[PDB]
Design a protein around this ligand. Structure first.
Ligand SMILES: Cc1c[nH]c(-c2cnc(NCCNc3ccc(C#N)cn3)nc2-c2ccc(Cl)cc2Cl)n1
Lengths: 345, 4
């Protein structure tokens, strides 16, 4: 049961003994393997992610987790190399009981859709997590509901799995084949190598539509079929839209397909402010897509800024307004909307 | 991802 190691942690340079037990496997995947454990000193639950190797690719997940401190991002407590094939790296992370994907599935299996209030809360904290990494120029590049940790009582969301994460710098190129296929932005389908962090915003728009539809909006069988799925809703891209996604890409004609009206994409009950926000996220043109802070300020979230807002269980909402100056870097003037009067000072 |  009990296991002991020495690791530095986030804050200092102070390797120290930490002991954990009751270890259980959570899952296997592209991220490696994640275990649950109890830290012996505090009794707190933790998640432990194990991954590697140099392979020919430039991983970055450490050096990104050490830089981040956000209530909507899972925190890195500790890390420690170990045996287990080759050496092994372990990241010790905050444990969170659920994922948005699992909770969205629980509603779908009951032929229920996730309540809008949870759609607003979950989507708002994701964009807030996105605004924070994007202020550092960092792009998550794998925004999918499986990577959205969630505490069901508090409705707190925590972005996780930064194993695809990269700090984008103009003029450096980046692989096009990145991001789970269903959430992959069209620029990536077109082979663009100069893409911005706007791809995460496209992915967040896929998550939003999925939370409204109860199933993924663009389930492609291939990268090429992913573009067909998008076209069936967005309709055929038109130059310059193709040009804005990939300036060097050229000949695409493709039968012209009329866009499906956005009101017909979603069930009739869907509130227009959710449909309208989605239209401003699922744009072909990356520059047309909203910034995360611009999404937070969207009217779809106005209910979260009301003074008389409570979770359906009656608990207070998680903190939504404790913005840092860094978090507001993209547009500090937006704070007047983002911070409602009752939350000021 | 990117190689190298
Ligand atoms: C096969 C498979 C794929 N995904 C899962 C899965 C299922 N259930 C849960 N529940 C959340 C448990 N709490 C957690 C989980 C992770 C972290 C962190 N970092 C913190 N807290 N989490 C995952 C999960 C989600 C993200 C990753 Cl990177 C890995 C896993 Cl195993 N199983």
């Amino acid at each position: 049961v009990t296991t002991v190691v020495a690791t530095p942690g986030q804050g200092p340079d102070r390797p120290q003994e930490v002991s954990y037990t009751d270890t259980k496997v959570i899952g296997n995947g592209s991220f490696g393997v994640v275990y649950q454990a109890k830290l012996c000193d505090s009794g707190e639950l933790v998640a432990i992610k194990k991954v590697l190797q140099d392979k020919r690719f430039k991983n970055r997940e450490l050096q990104i987790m050490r830089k981040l401190d956000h209530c909507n991002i899972v925190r890195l407590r500790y890390f420690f190399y170990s045996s287990g094939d080759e050496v092994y790296l372990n990241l010790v992370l905050d444990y969170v009981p659920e994922t948005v994907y699992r909770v969205a599935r629980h509603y779908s299996r009951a032929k229920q859709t996730l309540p809008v209030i949870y759609v607003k809360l979950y989507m708002y904290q994701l964009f807030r997590s996105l605004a924070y990494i994007h202020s550092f120029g960092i792009c998550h590049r794998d925004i999918k509901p499986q990577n959205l940790l969630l505490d069901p009582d508090t409705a707190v969301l925590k972005l996780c799995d930064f194993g695809s994460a990269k700090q984008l710098v103009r003029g450096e190129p980046n692989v096009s084949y990145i991001c789970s296929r269903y959430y992959r932005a069209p620029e990536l389908i077109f082979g663009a190598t100069d893409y911005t962090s706007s791809i995460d915003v496209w992915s967040a728009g896929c998550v939003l539509a999925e939370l409204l539809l109860g199933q993924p909006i663009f389930p492609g069988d291939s990268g090429v079929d992913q573009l067909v799925e998008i076209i069936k809703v967005l309709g055929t891209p038109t130059r310059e839209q193709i040009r804005e996604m990939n300036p060097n890409y050229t000949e695409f004609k493709f039968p012209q397909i009329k866009a499906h009206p956005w009101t017909k994409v979603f069930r009739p009950r869907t509130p227009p402010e959710a449909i309208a926000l989605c239209s401003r996220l699922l744009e072909y043109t990356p520059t047309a897509r909203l910034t995360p802070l611009e999404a937070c300020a969207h009217s779809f979230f106005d209910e979260l800024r009301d003074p008389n807002v409570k979770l359906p269980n009656g608990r207070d909402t998680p903190a939504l307004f404790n913005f840092t100056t860094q978090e507001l870097s993209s547009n500090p003037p937006l704070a007047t909307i983002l911070i409602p009067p009752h939350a000021r000072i | 991802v990117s190689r190298r």
